[PDB]
Design a protein around this ligand. Structure first.
Ligand code: HEM
Ligand code: HEM
Lengths: 466, 466
């Protein structure tokens, strides 16, 4: 009920006083972000709370964050928190621990190099054209557009083609059984009744595992495992067809300790899970900010037209030339860091930067609250891309601004996700301008659940530049 | 039900084919020893079986045993199998794991040196006199004597005085609340219904832990924790009284990483648990063999009388002079190695002595079966102390004969237990001879439960040498 609930009291660390059994989870009734913001305001640089009986130590000092994410990653702070019955997906790189994670990160690191990304760009660009065509249908119909739907389909299109060479126009083919399954790989809501109950009753997770109950949908993981099996068998029957998708990269990495067959499928699944809703969410937030800041949208369209005259198709190198595009993406990720928090489990008693941290504590970095901390950001609630201009970006501490984490366990898809989103943004802004409609919620309100998402879906009027 | 049950089949390792859920536990219906003997006979040098879903790999090659117990102890084979809800007794040295065990073994190793034992010998010897007095009461009454009762009291007397300076004649004071509690610290029967159920349902152990259900009796551990607290407070109130018990040694080791207060109590309890029933059991087996081999008993009495003329009291150095006494003890421990098995969990995939062993497998050394293996022992079912004579003992492989284990995690009480038993044996044989009575079971039969013990308690006629 309370065994660990005296820990922060004994260490002299402030925080909200926990209830028996629940710890502090009733404080999540307005979501993770308001809880972290309010704790930061009332307790200062460090504080502790309890997710059930699990102690969590929040840290905000940039030097201490670097020690945790970078300096002592391999020695002390190697793994994330365990989160529920996970089955074979225990082998997914984001879930793996210690030397198993370190191996998978080695096997998969070459897959995400800029050189491999550059070869994927033509595939990603194809679906920006598909996005533009589908957008244009809804633009000369005058209907306001639900961004999560069109960017959801775009995100899914890019995934299926860059992961498996499966080429689908998912918006217009929603009944395709491939899309029907992958679309179920949505982010977990850790404030939903199931995950709250597992937080209060963590002793039930082994029971769920022994019964093969998994938080990833069994029908979907069964479908995808079967599919990758058949795909790998087909690529054996046609070795002349030279492919550049993530499956082929992992197939090639299986020969000259290497990836097992089930480890391969776990990564295929986690890449869909990692990229699907995140990409569409960020794209939706970005378009919301551009619609509500027309001067920014116009400046960005001017940059795109200067780099790519007359709707010239974007390329790897021309994307990297667009400074203001980078600033807009980075400033939206500052406001809306969809991970909300970074976490590492402390593997052993340590003293870092003068503070003792016991073995077993989860150390948490509250990215959302730090992204909006007025000690580090002038007017942090405002959308101001110039924060990230060449004459201002030196003021930005890389352990305060952490939308993709930091250190050896940072986001391995970061370069891909940025290139993916920028290519979409370029193609859509070459062709359309986005404006608020009657049904647009302004100012945007955030959901009170466990996911960083708008309270109501973002809807925008879409107009052809022609 | 069966997830791991294909492991030994896939590795090409022979063994009894497991049933769903149960594994091979129905094969324990005649105890651990007959199972290990029969497996060794039918499968050869290595075999595998399943305790529920837990794979166990039995090894018999002396080189491989050395690698496991000695060479790769710290790297790969550091811990024993987990066995049930254990509460704070997780800190007992026999239960601790990895660096926590390595620390406790360092803190407690100086406590068991020959120098500290030599200072304890006068205390142990006092209770050999008490044993002789109590024996003499039952000898001039002509009643056959139940060995577990008189050696149980002796074992308990030595424990209370060498552990805590508590001086009790436990045979004649059974209602003393100290004795009433410590006497409940009997060995676990891992074939009893509770431990079989936990073997089949290991996913229930976390539920028991969260409810503070412990396999060590709570009333007893509560009593002893309270007692050690009051004892430590008294020794503070009388620092001139200089003590040589295990409590004082651990108190002194607390000052010039060191032992915590709760770690101290856990060791006090585990030392009673480790020494109480083991010592009395071995003493009973030894006296059974001496009663049924009068020529051995006479030869031993002749050696004792030569080293200690006219019932001279034994001392540390004169005990170590008695070669035949050592041979008798060692040969009884060969027949009756009360641990039955040694076990280590494999922490990582390794290849030792040409064999691949996966992470998570329990490697087991079947001491009982190896002690009775005719490849290593002429007529292994016979009691033959001369096996251990100076002209024969070189034939004895120290990884086949393992009554106290081997390597860094061997029995830390070995020297104490041997000195304890030898001092008792000397004092009793100086005063009495032991003979079979009408109610003595000859040949001795072993129990079919989970503990190496006689089927019926050993009873012997006891006669004064006068
Ligand atoms: C805008 C899109 C994305 C954002 C904001 C994002 C953000 C993050 C963050 C904050 C982390 C935690 C890093 C840490 O704990 O230090 C993470 C980890 C990770 N991300 Fe992303 N991510 C995005 C897209 C993707 C994509 C598209 C992929 C794969 C194709 C991906 C794969 C991963 C993986 C595998 C990890 C765990 C890495 C490890 O444990 O070694 N992410 N991401
Ligand atoms: C005839 C009496 C005894 C016998 C036959 C015996 C036998 C054993 C055996 C076979 C082991 C396992 C070693 C291994 O796994 O390699 C062991 C471990 C151990 N024994 Fe004994 N024992 C006896 C008495 C005692 C006594 C009297 C004490 C304490 C006062 C004691 C304390 C321990 C401890 C603490 C361990 C675990 C050591 C560790 O994990 O570091 N034993 N014993």
């Amino acid at each position: 009920g309370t065994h660990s609930h005296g820990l922060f009291k004994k260490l002299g660390i402030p925080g909200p006083t926990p209830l028996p059994f629940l710890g502090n989870i009733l404080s999540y009734h307005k979501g993770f972000c308001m809880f972290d913001m309010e704790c930061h305001k009332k307790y200062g640089k460090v504080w502790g709370f309890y997710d059930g009986q699990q102690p969590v130590l929040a840290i905000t000092d940039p030097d201490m964050i670097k020690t945790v994410l970078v300096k002592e990653c391999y020695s002390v702070f190697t793994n994330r928190r365990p989160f529920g019955p996970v089955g074979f997906m225990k082998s997914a790189i984001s879930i793996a621990e210690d030397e198993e994670w370190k191996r998978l990160r080695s096997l998969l690191s070459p897959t995400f190099t800029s050189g491999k990304l550059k070869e994927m760009v033509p595939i990603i660009a194809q679906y920006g054209d598909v996005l533009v065509r589908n957008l244009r249908r809804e633009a000369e119909t005058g209907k306001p557009v639900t961004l999560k739907d069109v960017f959801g389909a775009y995100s899914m299109d890019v995934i299926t083609s860059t992961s498996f060479g499966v080429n689908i126009d998912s918006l217009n083919n929603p009944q395709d059984p491939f899309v029907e399954n992958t679309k179920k790989l949505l982010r977990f809501d850790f404030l939903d009744p199931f995950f709250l109950s597992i937080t209060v009753f963590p002793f039930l997770i082994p029971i769920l595992e022994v019964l093969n109950i998994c938080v990833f949908p069994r029908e979907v993981t069964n479908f995808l495992r079967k599919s990758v099996k058949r795909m790998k068998e087909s690529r054996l029957e046609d070795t002349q067809k030279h492919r550049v998708d993530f499956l082929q990269l992992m197939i090639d990495s299986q020969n000259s300790k290497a990836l097992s067959d089930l480890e391969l499928v776990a990564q295929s699944i986690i890449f869909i899970f990692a990229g699907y809703e995140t990409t569409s969410s960020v794209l939706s937030f970005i378009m919301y900010e551009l619609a509500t800041h027309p001067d920014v949208q116009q400046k960005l369209q001017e940059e795109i037209d200067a780099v790519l005259p007359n709707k010239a198709p974007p390329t790897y190198d021309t994307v990297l030339q667009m400074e203001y595009l980078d600033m807009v993406v980075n400033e939206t990720l500052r406001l809306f860091p969809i991970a909300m928090r970074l976490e590492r489990v402390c593997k052993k008693d340590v003293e870092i930067n003068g503070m003792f941290i016991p073995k077993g504590v989860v150390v948490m970095i509250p990215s959302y609250a730090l992204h909006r901390d007025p000690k580090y950001w002038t007017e942090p609630e405002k959308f101001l891309p110039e924060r990230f201009s060449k004459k201002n970006k030196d003021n930005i501490d890389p352990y305060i601004y952490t939308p993709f984490g930091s250190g050896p366990r940072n986001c391995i898809g970061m370069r891909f996700a940025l290139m993916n989103m920028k290519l979409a943004l370029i193609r859509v802004l070459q062709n359309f301008s986005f404006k608020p409609s009657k049904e647009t919620q302004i100012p945007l309100k955030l959901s009170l659940g466990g996911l960083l998402q708008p309270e109501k879906p973002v809807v925008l009027k879409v107009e052809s530049r022609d």
